Specification:
10 copies of one chain form a homodecamer. Chain A has 191 residues and is an alpha+beta fold. The first copy, chain A, folds into 2 domains: 1-59, no CATH class; 60-191, no CATH class. Chain A is 44% helix and 28% strand. Chain A is built from 8 helices and 7 strands; from the N terminus they run αααββββαβαβαβαα. The first copy, chain A, has helices at residues 4-24, 37-48, 56-60, 108-119, 125-140, 154-157, 176-179, 181-190; strands at residues 64-69, 73-84, 90-100, 103-106, 122-123, 144-153, 167-175. In chain A, strands 5-2-3-6-7 form a 5-stranded mixed sheet. The first copy, chain A, has a two-stranded antiparallel sheet with strand order 1-4. In chain A, a hairpin with a 5-residue loop joins strand 2 (73-84) and strand 3 (90-100). In chain A, helix 1 crosses helix 2 (37-48) and helix 4 packs across helix 5 (125-140). The longest helix of chain A is centred in the first third of the chain and has 21 residues, at 4-24. The interface between I and J is large, with 45 and 46 residues. The complex binds 7-deaza-GTP (4 copies) and zinc ion (10 copies). Chain F: One of its GO terms (biological process) is response to type II interferon. Chain F: It catalyses: GTP + H2O = 7,8-dihydroneopterin 3'-triphosphate + formate + H(+). Chain F: Its EC number is 3.5.4.16.
Amino acid sequence: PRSEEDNELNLPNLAAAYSSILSSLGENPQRQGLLKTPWRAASAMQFFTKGYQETISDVLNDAIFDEDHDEMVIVKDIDMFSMCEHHLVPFVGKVHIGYLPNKQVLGLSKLARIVEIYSRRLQVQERLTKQIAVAITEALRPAGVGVVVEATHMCMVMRGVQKMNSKTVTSTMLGVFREDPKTREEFLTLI
Amino acid sequence: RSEEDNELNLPNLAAAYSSILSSLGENPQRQGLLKTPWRAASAMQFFTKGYQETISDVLNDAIFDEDHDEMVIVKDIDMFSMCEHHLVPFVGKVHIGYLPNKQVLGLSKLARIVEIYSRRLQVQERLTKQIAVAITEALRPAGVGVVVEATHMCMVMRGVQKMNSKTVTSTMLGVFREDPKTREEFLTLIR
Amino acid sequence: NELNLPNLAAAYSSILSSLGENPQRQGLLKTPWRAASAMQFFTKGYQETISDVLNDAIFDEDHDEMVIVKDIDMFSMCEHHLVPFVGKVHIGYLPNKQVLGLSKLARIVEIYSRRLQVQERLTKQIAVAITEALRPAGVGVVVEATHMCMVMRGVQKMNSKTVTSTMLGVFREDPKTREEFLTLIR
Amino acid sequence: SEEDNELNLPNLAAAYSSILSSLGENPQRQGLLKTPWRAASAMQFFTKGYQETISDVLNDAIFDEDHDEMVIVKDIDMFSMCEHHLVPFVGKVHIGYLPNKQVLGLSKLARIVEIYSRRLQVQERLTKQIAVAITEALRPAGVGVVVEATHMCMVMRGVQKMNSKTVTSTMLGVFREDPKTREEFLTLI
Amino acid sequence: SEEDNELNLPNLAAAYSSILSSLGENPQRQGLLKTPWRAASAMQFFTKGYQETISDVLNDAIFDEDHDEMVIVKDIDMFSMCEHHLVPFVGKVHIGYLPNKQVLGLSKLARIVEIYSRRLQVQERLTKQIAVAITEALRPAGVGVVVEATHMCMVMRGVQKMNSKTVTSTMLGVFREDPKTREEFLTLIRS
Amino acid sequence: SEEDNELNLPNLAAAYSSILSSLGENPQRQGLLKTPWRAASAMQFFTKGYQETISDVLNDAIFDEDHDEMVIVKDIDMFSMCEHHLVPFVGKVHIGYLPVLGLSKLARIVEIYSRRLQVQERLTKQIAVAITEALRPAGVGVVVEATHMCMVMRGVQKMNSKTVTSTMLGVFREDPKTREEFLTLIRS
Amino acid sequence: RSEEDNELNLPNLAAAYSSILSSLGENPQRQGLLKTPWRAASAMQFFTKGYQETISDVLNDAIFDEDHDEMVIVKDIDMFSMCEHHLVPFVGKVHIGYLPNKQVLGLSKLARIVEIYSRRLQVQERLTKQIAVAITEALRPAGVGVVVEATHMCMVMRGVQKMNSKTVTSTMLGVFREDPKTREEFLTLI
Amino acid sequence: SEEDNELNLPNLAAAYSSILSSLGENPQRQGLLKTPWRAASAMQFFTKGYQETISDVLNDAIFDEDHDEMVIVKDIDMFSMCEHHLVPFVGKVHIGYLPNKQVLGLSKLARIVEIYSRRLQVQERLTKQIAVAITEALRPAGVGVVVEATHMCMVMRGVQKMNSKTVTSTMLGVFREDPKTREEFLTLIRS
Amino acid sequence: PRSEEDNELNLPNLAAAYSSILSSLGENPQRQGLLKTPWRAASAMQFFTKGYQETISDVLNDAIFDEDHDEMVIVKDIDMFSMCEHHLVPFVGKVHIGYLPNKQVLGLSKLARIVEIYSRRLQVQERLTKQIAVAITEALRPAGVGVVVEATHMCMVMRGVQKMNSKTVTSTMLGVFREDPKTREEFLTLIR
Amino acid sequence: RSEEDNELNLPNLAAAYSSILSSLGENPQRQGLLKTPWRAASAMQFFTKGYQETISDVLNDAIFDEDHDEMVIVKDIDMFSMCEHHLVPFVGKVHIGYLPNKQVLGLSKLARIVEIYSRRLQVQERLTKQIAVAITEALRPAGVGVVVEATHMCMVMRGVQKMNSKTVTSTMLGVFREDPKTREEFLTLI
Ligand SMILES: Nc1nc2c(ccn2[C@@H]2O[C@H](COP(=O)(O)OP(=O)(O)OP(=O)(O)O)[C@@H](O)[C@H]2O)c(=O)[nH]1
Ligand SMILES: Nc1nc2c(ccn2[C@@H]2O[C@H](COP(=O)(O)OP(=O)(O)OP(=O)(O)O)[C@@H](O)[C@H]2O)c(=O)[nH]1
Ligand SMILES: Nc1nc2c(ccn2[C@@H]2O[C@H](COP(=O)(O)OP(=O)(O)OP(=O)(O)O)[C@@H](O)[C@H]2O)c(=O)[nH]1
Ligand SMILES: Nc1nc2c(ccn2[C@@H]2O[C@H](COP(=O)(O)OP(=O)(O)OP(=O)(O)O)[C@@H](O)[C@H]2O)c(=O)[nH]1
Ligand SMILES: [Zn+2]
Ligand SMILES: [Zn+2]
Ligand SMILES: [Zn+2]
Ligand SMILES: [Zn+2]
Ligand SMILES: [Zn+2]
Ligand SMILES: [Zn+2]
Ligand SMILES: [Zn+2]
Ligand SMILES: [Zn+2]
Ligand SMILES: [Zn+2]
Ligand SMILES: [Zn+2]
């Protein structure tokens, strides 16, 4: 995984590349508004890709509780901010997660923290959706998991096709959410 | 800026984007990243295409004599710009109003003037002033009012991480600045 | 109209051929005629006169307060590209004792909207027609429209809306009358 | 192609000038002077779709993401032209598909909409054409396309029904054969 | 009077039966058998305001509450009949008044609306009649009445404009003479 | 017919004049002077549908588009007249069918039956049967949602009450999944 | 109940309301409370007017032969009732659906049946069942579905004080009870 | 004051039992058995404001925060009883005040609403009482109170006007004398 | 169960701990705004945990009627205010309850009062949801019970993940609500 | 406040929270409460992190010369604070407007100034004033306007228990206070 030492070491290389981009765009990197931009853009890009340095074990912090619960738990409307790996422009939206506990429940915030491990990377929405579902499955081993991601890709609104209102909806269903249609429909209506 | 400048600077932009991918700990050779230095460079060139535009070419002599001396408004113009401090988008709406001096501007040219200045590395306050000044210079009307409302992704997906924050800026010239009733009317007609 | 119909159909058939289309296809067989009839309907306002439209609908109701007819659906044609511009018209007026038939305000909108237009002109024409037909203390007309030339083409700005207004008499000279009208139409 | 456009532009402008005269208008007045040309260029833009090929539009944007679950791109703004009256019909396209391991690049679904919407159309045909284009480009497990549109021919003339909306759909593969897949797509849009 | 209603009911039923025959319909079919009577009774109910007097409606509901501030009763559902085509016009009435120490019973404002709306009307007349009735019944510092209505003569026939709404108003006393009182009333009703 | 309309307009106007007098009103006052004729013309317009035939309305607008999937035209504004009280009932019509008819013809079929003295249940069935007879499709579904002014401005005086009626023919009646797909696609 | 019963019981109702005003520490002689024993008694008599009604008189023979065998719904019927436990209102909407057996009922008569039972001292569950049973007895249709959604003021301005709380009750008879597809179609259409 | 409730409870229950008999009901049926007592307790709760004093309610919650600017507590749910029919009238209270350096604890504005709303009322009186109680408890530069309510006497009986809402207001001090203060308060209370 | 004597005895222990918190945060417990805070915070925490002091029997008050009702009764949008047991920060939302009476019906307000027994405690949402459904099944013995809780956890919005719009939805289905899918879907659509 | 103060005071906060769990009648040894004294103490430190912040460090020299003399507004800034009277949150939105004196501030610094004062034990009126004064001192503009709209949980989940009540406070400095037209323009734009 990526480290804070890797971030400090790579920051001047990122700043050098951003300064080179400003010059290549016809801009003056010495004007007041651009003076600190190579560094602020480099730090922003490091923050946008901070998920690479995260591990599921550290994120969970042993937040698995024995609540004798065998019914669907949903955490919906998790704000998600990711980066398109094809154009390096953001894609933002919401993540809705549902799961069937096998007696043990995961701490509610850990579902949002798992979203943050994978969303803070250079992504493709389909991959991001699958990774979240698989992480929950491996961390807790529940009866089933369901993940739905709804996002606006800025590559499709401020450029290219320039379709203003287009939204991409992806889903990943594991266990009972995949095998039992009634579980799957209940999750989709509750979100 | 020119199209020759774009062709010449494209490989330098692609080189800097490839360097960024390596500095972030990513593999520039994986399927999803193979064409990214080029697609990211082309996207950044499109986002900064306003530098190569001139008001005269954009207007195309669209000034008509309609014996009109009353406020004309073009509201809800979708605007997509790039924060010059972090190189992350800031997007929103532009609302333009003007009092013609017998002659009217072609409706679309107001949105095209927005595109000259929004497709640049910007600060919202500057973008707002530039649009109002361009309209005043192109038409010489009794007055111009420009209101920009935008979401800065630098404030939502990083830093302060304030989800719902919106920045509202305005520039009032001529009668819109000197006459309070004119400014009061424009502001009500745009909501 | 009857004499012009075959000339319009001939021009529309010529357009179909110039676009690379087969004017003989089942779907395009009656298109030169349906397109010509549609364009005649879209421009029917040229053949209308204010006097015939009013039909003597002026009533003596001893009214000296603002009457508003808002949300009148308006469908016009951009004279620059020949593509529609559609929206709403909001009309207000201050009668001079005599009130006008409510539908006649919408019928005045139809005289000028069913023409090749520019929104600023259309707005002025409606206000002037009301002033000439009734001679009231004042008239106010607000038009809010979507120009398809700006949404399906050119700038391709999906949510842009154009707002125009024409204030005559008391609506122009008295700011309080003007602001009351603007709040009552929202 | 672009060569055909330049050659046919003066013939389109001549026909539009003829229309202005036949409507009782003055083609020499300020507002109408450039109209035969602007109207001809607009009609050529509205009919771009004819000169486009699926292969060029896709640009090899097919990625191996080991995905076998429904992908939806909804609320794609669509602007088309009624072939019966030559008046626009505008709305939204909602596309869903069940990939077979490989995923098409999201924008290419919106670009496929543009190939067939920028033509003289009938909504039912446009709906089928998008669904078929996706099936042919990707060969997925299934495709679902829903188009919801306002026909200006029904709002500004004829029946003059202001609020009427036409909803069409085309379901191929698993979207047609499996009722549960089809209902899931319809609720997610 | 109720004596006038009993006496005129068979004449109304005879005219409605005559209408059914003149429209090409069969007045003897099951659906139309009782229609001349049900239509006549409905028309008598729609015009019941003619048999009402302000004094009877008021029922001495004037209380001494030492109140000199604006009282508003808004969103009063109003159903009237167009006198030009005999088709309904329906909407809302918003009434405001500045008491002169004495306050009218809230329901009596709606009952005054019913005296004038249940008649063959013109919206401008109906608005004035309500304001004048309140001024005569109470003698307050001022009265304001705003009527917003959909005329079915404009939606299901003639111009056939579906969304058109007619807004009329009558301001008496302080509501007419003091602009600030008038604007306060207009903002408090636009809920 | 139009000759029937010219012959019956004076009688309608005399019956309306008689109504104005029987209500205690003055048919000689300015507001009422032209009302007998204008109310008569309005009632004729509201009952226009009886003079219309499906064949004339269709205008041969049947196209071969090789379509076997559901086509829906929803939110068609409908204005009808209650046959029990002669007061309007207004709302929306949502039509679905499995083929190809010209889209506007569905709204024109609504106008044939809505412009008559009606009962909502009858109006709904007539629209569905007219489409089935004109096209012979796999199935038709018609949903009418209306406000009856007889129930809001008089009688029970229930302000927000709405009546929903439906008619399902062919596959829309026999196949549960086709009817449930149509019912979800008409929700706006 | 009858109108003669209302004239006879009116002074006893007014006496009880006057007694309530005195027991609350109020002055029944002050301007605002002077006519209150009578206006409160008349209001309570109007709120309980459903006791003096009969299904047969309210239907007024409004049964038409329209050859209809498909679902008819009258939704959003405003309903105002009185809680029999605290004598405080419970108000909301009634949504009625039915599958005719060729014959249709007059639209307003469904709302009039709601008025027979809502204008009484009630419990929402009883009110819901009574409306469904009255329609079944008046029409004998294939099935009836009734859904009542109400705000009980006893739960918002007093007691538990949960002001967004809404009670939803339902009664399904015939095909609405036995056929799940009929039941779900009715619930989505309302 | 609490002793008055225990002493008067059997007299209230006797009057409610008498009402049940006079309505033609059986006071001995299961649903009506505890009703004379539950109705009496409910009426005592609805009129509990009579036993409250401003001094006890305030609990010395006056803080010195050097504040001289408008403080607003809007959307206070209010439940009162119509003194004419003994049927509820419910709505919202929006209070504004200009402090004279000292600020009242926010909750005490809602508690002042409860002193006067829990009584047999007239909306105009209730509005004035709240404003006068605040003016007396703090002696601020000015007070503004707006009450918006639905009278059940007007919806489930009498005029039977479903959507009618009564809006009353009381402005004291600067809120009454300064029009700009008054309009600022009225705009800030719109939600 | 907790008692009023327990509350009086522990109130000065709670104020002492709150006063200690004010000092440990670097604040001045003697400034005007903080002077009564140890007591007001202690009383508030006692109110937030009053459900421990309550028993189902006292709460019901014999409001179990004998109607002839065998159809679904729903009480939805019950405002619920609870306290996260992990951080001692509120979690607030709505509770929607549905049940199938076995002829006997419960008093409507008692469903909301059962919500109050368990929500006014240091909780976990999944536990709170189950306790409400189990209390209803034990008090009434109906054909089935369904409970849905939708809440905003302030630990998730004003700190930690800081996800502004995140909502947690939990459910507990007993009897016919668990075993019959049609009953379950009807309840879920009627609560929207 | 400092990071050393936080490390030193964390065990004292945990001790007080453990003492609160015992005083409420709870079992501090049960699974769900075992780490609570520490998680509650860390949460309270985070809620009060504003005490360790200085306007100078927060600004980071983000003052730009953009020749701007017109109103800049940053609205809908989500704000989370703590009631100093009950130690229960009060949350809402902050809307800030200012008239620059040629120099503009970095947009995010307005939200960061909100965070200095909201992350403390507060009173809404003080929070609003502190926010407007910090902007005036940092930039010296022509005027500043701050509006705070909040839900106090002390008033919704306890005490008066008024569900929908919202507190609106404002602070206007400079031209926002002295020019009524500037003040009204700001209030409509937010
Ligand atoms: N007036 C104005 N301000 C603008 C933009 C665009 C950006 N900015 C603002 O420039 C500042 C740069 O600050 P900095 O050097 O401290 O960076 P950094 O530590 O990464 O900051 P932060 O984001 O707080 O983490 C920020 O305050 C940012 O918001 C605009 O349009 N108008
Ligand atoms: N199925 C159906 N029913 C319809 C219409 C239109 C109307 N009706 C209903 O005929 C009944 C006639 O009753 P009646 O003779 O007793 O009239 P009247 O005393 O004035 O009654 P009311 O209105 O209660 O005061 C009413 O119930 C009315 O609603 C329709 O479309 N479909
Ligand atoms: N200003 C004011 N007025 C109020 C209340 C509360 C009630 N009222 C009004 O007292 C009047 C009592 O009249 P009355 O004697 O004629 O009764 P009744 O025949 O049953 O009447 P009605 O209702 O028409 O059937 C009504 O007008 C009612 O609205 C309030 O808060 N402020
Ligand atoms: N199923 C059903 N139940 C109904 C009504 C109407 C009321 N009720 C419920 O009877 C119960 C009475 O209990 P009780 O004797 O203890 O009274 P009281 O202490 O004042 O109660 P509370 O309000 O908690 O303070 C309450 O639960 C009430 O809501 C209905 O329509 N259906
Ligand atoms: Zn991209
Ligand atoms: Zn930035
Ligand atoms: Zn154009
Ligand atoms: Zn067409
Ligand atoms: Zn009319
Ligand atoms: Zn009727
Ligand atoms: Zn009750
Ligand atoms: Zn009353
Ligand atoms: Zn927590
Ligand atoms: Zn507090």
